[PDB]
Amino acid sequence: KNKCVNFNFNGLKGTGVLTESNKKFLPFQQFGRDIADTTDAVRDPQTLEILDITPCSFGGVSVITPGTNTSNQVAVLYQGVNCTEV
């Protein structure tokens, strides 16, 4: 749990982070989908408990630079992310 792992639940493959889930879907319900119709909540076959699936931390990276004619130092901008989490 709590890290970027490749998982396979009853032939359902994926990659992400499995975390404890506070969702409370009824005992008969097995899977959990979302607004985009993707499985984000699952239940372990061995032990009947709820897990939330979150995609691993991704983001966009861009480079600030002056022209190479005058210098070659660069800076890095990580779009839309707090850098205490990189």
Binding site: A36, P55, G60, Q79, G80
Partner: peptide
């Protein structure tokens, strides 16, 4: 006041260069 969401698919919204305070 008269004028008024989590997409992992890869769609992002970039902030504008000019903040509302500068426009004001």
């Amino acid at each position: 006041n008269k004028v008024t969401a989590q997409k992992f698919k890869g769609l992002t919204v970039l902030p504008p260069l000019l903040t509302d305070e500068m426009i004001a």
